[PDB]
Design a protein around this ligand. Structure first.
Ligand SMILES: CC(=O)N[C@@H](Cc1ccc2ccccc2c1)C(=O)O
Ligand SMILES: CC(=O)N[C@@H](Cc1ccc2ccccc2c1)C(=O)O
Ligand SMILES: CC(=O)N[C@@H](Cc1ccc2ccccc2c1)C(=O)O
Ligand SMILES: CC(=O)N[C@@H](Cc1ccc2ccccc2c1)C(=O)O
Ligand SMILES: [Mg+2]
Ligand SMILES: [Mg+2]
Ligand SMILES: [Mg+2]
Ligand SMILES: [Mg+2]
Lengths: 367, 367, 367, 368
């Protein structure tokens, strides 16, 4: 229908523990939420930008700005709107993928609710539940790490992903392997921390049988990744580099990636994410669902996406309580190492308005 | 859902004119129809198989057979069913793609009718109408062809496609080009009638500025097509060879194709066809909508498909009256060279059930 | 001569043991036989299609149908016929290779009987006997398989091939290698059960010195096999993929295969199988004779084929009693690990009619 | 079956006109015939070697010598002979392909006569007649060439092949094209007379639309031929270089050849030639049947072979009278540009004994 307006909210949520990555430590999660309003009713979008431009060039205040002043006005000016039409209507604006994706999610959730159709149904789900791995930060000490991993294993997460960076790579892997053995599904994630000159150091990870090293080098260095793959045994996985289905196709032709992490906001929305799934499937490349420490709306959408057929490695969509004591929707609870795929219309979750209000820091209408 | 069963009907409809291709002439179009019945209501699929195994290894009685004894049962035995789920349920059965596609189409029309959503919406349409070309058969004499062509250009069709075979290639193209000039969008299609040995002959098309030559060699000879592309100026388009998204990705990697003809039945479904579109888009390969001389059901499904964003060349989805004096649904009518995209739920068209019956041959209930 | 007509029989013979493959369990062997009739005399052909389309798109009922309504008629309409001329006379029909091969086999046995020549002599045999291995199905438990294999070695079979599937690969192999040691010629066969995503699992085969792994991926994924070959140590062998001498040439050019399994019916006849053998020999690629659990008619022909110079690995053509209590011809009996090559005219073997009668289920005469 | 022995004949037949190639002129055809004698009957083989080692390293006296002292004893020492087993029985002897193929032809003719089967049926024939071209020698003057080509065209040959060499390439092809037009199937053959340094001279053939240039470079220069193909428009055809099916696979893989000339003697026999035909067809490479100015025997086997499905270009198997006033078998006569495929058992022809006797200069029996 014609979109009436969009309500944009700043939202802040404490983390159960600080989460430390190669680019820093956050203790809180700030995020934007969008609520699209149509004659038909309503839809929810979550943006995955972080507070400052440390993971990619996009950040909360920048997403909000491009949202208020470009993206939202362009959709409000359109005659008939459809999730699929969002992309062409926003095409003239370069980049701003996470902001575009957030807004596409909200249009999609509104549309789908109006057709009593789930996200899972629209995306092409073949599974009622998905297996879930867990992502683990850099720690101050090896023993703090072992106890943390140990804990996650006990609750039955199927795979352990370790954040790494120079000075924290080989040792923490060695120690996790000595304590928990060669059978645990183990992978590493640099968030762009190394260079091609670090190859011999990343080769010292060969003896530990990791599933993948995720984004060892910078976002723009795709040829460098192909070069690095000729020198290390650990399969390369790309995250920040995979900004679109075309980018996935390019990386695969160039021998720069054997496994692709998918994050919907990173590629510009759930529709593009599906295309990425499909392009990868066609080239025989396994995909998995990435996590941006989303609240329950984004987690719901990701759980759905993650049940597509080519998702053949456990994703990062951990249960609500891996990050939050109190989520803003009905929480996701781990159950035999798995999470259930949401069932109702659209996302199949909405925010509980008392909980959302506690953690809303600002609210603006754009109409 | 749970499927109740499927009415499998043999139909047969006369053509305005006999249609001559490199593999034969048919004067009449015979097909299967499937009416799937669920609790949520009912959907129509059309099968694209022809009478004998002359285009591919699949044909009417053979589809009908694999459908009755293999496919339709495996769906009837299923706990829950979605369009998406058809593929993995039918996966143990090798081949029979056109059959599987007719079935998925029927399930899909059911599903979408049950959510008041169009084919256009589910597939990701960005456009209300598609530009339309026509396919012109082999004729007895050059002047008989030059009239037929004259005619369709008069009706406002935007591109001409000519069936070609050894004996009927350079002369028809030279004549069409002498009669109608260089601005006409012109291409040829061989339905596998040449070998690599005929490259010098095909290179004789070089001066007529054709958009493409569609399937010059056999279905299996992907590498042969990449070889051929080194020897002739006319871009290669593939049809019979493009059996899946994976086969499209293979052919593009090998340099065997520059432009892909999409036929949803050939690739085993409208959902797979969507994947072929996205794989091609990600490699910068233009696609166009192919035609198996379907009724208004398949035509409705194809025009919806053809309105996807990477369909950037004119399809073969011609007006209903190009093939049939009367169609089994509301007819499609050319209007400034375009066909308009169906609006209502599912296909947005349904068999006028008096009209179906004048042209039906057999009926069987599987249940 | 001119062909008078063909007798088609459906036949059904119990198996000595159920045979389990990644696509299912066989307890009984259902097949078509063909008796071609000429003024001269008559010949026997065997179809290798199985009950339903789980190995390829071809099955018992669809072979029979394409035979009666397309293949056999086109030969009866023919003036002069030779085995060599079958191919161009059936060329207008796509696919149905197993059906075409059954028919060419019958024509060939008639033609050769009338010149008093063995299949061996026609095909180019250079050996009087051939070494034989055995194919061993998926077992319920490791000890059971260890007993079955133990039995087959004791009878003096020269090589063991184990069927494998996700769940049944590294353990069986490890087990077989523990009880019987590193000198036994051992290899595996997946019948398409893996994707390229399972490369790490398949590389877990590396230490066991397998001669080859047969068809790890789907029939159509030729490039996927070359990708997989860069990732594992075990040589790749193709079966389902090798449908022609041309498909074998392509797969060799792409690096997709290192050893080729030849099955006459899969490739559309003994004459095409001879071409496959010569194409691989010219490229230095070893071939070996595959088995389709044929009656002794097929087995006689396979044994003749397997005696060509480039069959330098042991074939799957086991003794009649590895599958059948009671063959329909004088049985093949293993002797110093070899089968002897048949000597008389044609197959050098014919159905014993009392026996052929107990196991016949239907009969039809095409004239 | 044991081979009983082989009668070896030297034969000399005059040519109707002297035949000139980049390696010389022949006005007489000297050749070897073999009559293999088995308990099941007789067969005829023809050796394609020429008098001296100017086309390849094999020649009539070398072929006779290797036959008497190596090839024939190995087959006579054998326990079982079939045509297929000839190859492994002789595999220890390196080279001598023309000599081996002559012996294989005779053995195969004997085996096929005994089963009452034609060469055509054993090879896989799919046609009853085959279109024929003519090979035209180097002449002293253009007008002599144009008269000769003019004559073969009136007789109905469907394709002209011109022998060429440095000094006789662009001009004859220019003339032939001016006199007879752009429609005539026209091709050239150098018999190794060029080097890669001559690529600019050979690119001067680009405007004339030739079907192919046959063997512009030496036998061993497979890489040089792939380089030459990057420089000229005329498709490359190989002849001397194609010595086996494997050599054909190799040249194709290297981009050295677009079209293959098959000569059965050159590849070591009709069975190997069937194999070259199959390898080429699997790669999309058209083949055509070559001619070594055989008598009716080799001509009969070549017409049979030329009727295989991948021979999609006209061969050099001209009518008997293009070379010989009197053939030693029933002669081959052109008819609507075609030759008919022989029909009876074996070759389908046999020497007329009085004619063979007029033309035999020596005969020796080689037995156990
Ligand atoms: C889920 C995971 O382990 N890492 C994400 C990115 C990430 C990293 C740091 C974050 C800090 C604040 C909010 C979101 C964040 C997301 C990744 O795959 O790289
Ligand atoms: C639309 C077009 O020009 N032809 C189809 C082939 C085709 C398809 C189905 C047919 C059914 C009956 C008779 C002829 C047919 C030809 C194609 O693109 O190859
Ligand atoms: C000899 C070997 O191991 N099997 C064949 C395939 C095969 C498999 C299962 C069958 C079941 C019923 C009838 C025929 C069958 C043929 C193969 O190599 O793939
Ligand atoms: C038929 C054709 O034009 N020439 C053959 C070879 C050839 C050339 C010269 C010869 C002289 C005497 C006897 C046999 C010969 C054969 C060729 O293609 O090269
Ligand atoms: Mg990451
Ligand atoms: Mg087409
Ligand atoms: Mg197999
Ligand atoms: Mg030559």
């Amino acid at each position: 229908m014609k979109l009436s307006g969009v309500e944009l909210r700043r939202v802040q949520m404490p983390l159960v523990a600080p989460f430390r990555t190669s680019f820093g430590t956050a203790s809180v999660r700030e995020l934007l939420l969008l609520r699209a309003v149509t004659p038909a009713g309503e839809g929810w979008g979550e943006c995955v930008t972080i507070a400052g431009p440390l993971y990619s060039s996009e950040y909360n205040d920048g997403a909000e700005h491009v949202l208020r002043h470009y993206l939202i006005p362009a959709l409000l000016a359109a005659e008939d709107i459809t999730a699929a039409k969002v992309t062409p209507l926003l095409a003239k604006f370069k980049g701003h993928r996470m902001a575009k994706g957030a807004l596409e999610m909200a249009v999609l959730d509104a549309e789908l609710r109006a057709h009593e159709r789930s996200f899972a149904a629209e995306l092409g789900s073949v599974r009622d539940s998905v297996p879930c791995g867990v992502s683990v930060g850099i720690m101050d000490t090896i023993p703090q790490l072992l106890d943390v991993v140990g804990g996650y294993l006990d609750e039955g997460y199927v795979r352990i992903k370790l954040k790494i960076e120079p000075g924290w790579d080989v040792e923490p892997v060695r120690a996790v392997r000595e304590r928990f053995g060669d059978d645990v599904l183990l992978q590493v994630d640099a968030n762009t921390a190394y260079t091609l000159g670090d190859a011999p150091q990343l080769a010292r990870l060969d003896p530990f049988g990791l599933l993948l090293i995720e984004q060892p080098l910078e976002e723009e260095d795709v040829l460098g990744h192909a070069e690095l793959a000729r020198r290390i045994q650990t399969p390369i996985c790309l995250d920040e580099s995979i900004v679109s289905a075309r980018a996935a196709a390019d990386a695969i032709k160039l021998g720069a990636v054997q496994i692709v992490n998918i994050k919907p906001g990173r590629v510009g929305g759930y529709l593009e994410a599906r295309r990425v799934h499909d392009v990868c499937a066609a080239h025989g490349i396994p995909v998995w669902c990435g996590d941006m420490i989303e609240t329950g709306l984004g987690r719901a959408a990701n759980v759905a996406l993650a049940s597509l057929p080519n998702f053949t490695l456990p994703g990062d969509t951990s249960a609500s309580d891996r990050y939050y004591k109190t989520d803003i929707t009905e929480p996701f609870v781990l159950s035999g190492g798995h999470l259930p795929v949401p069932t109702g219309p659209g996302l199949g979750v909405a925010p509980i308005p008392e909980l959302l209000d506690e953690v809303t820091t600002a609210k603006v209408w754009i109409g």
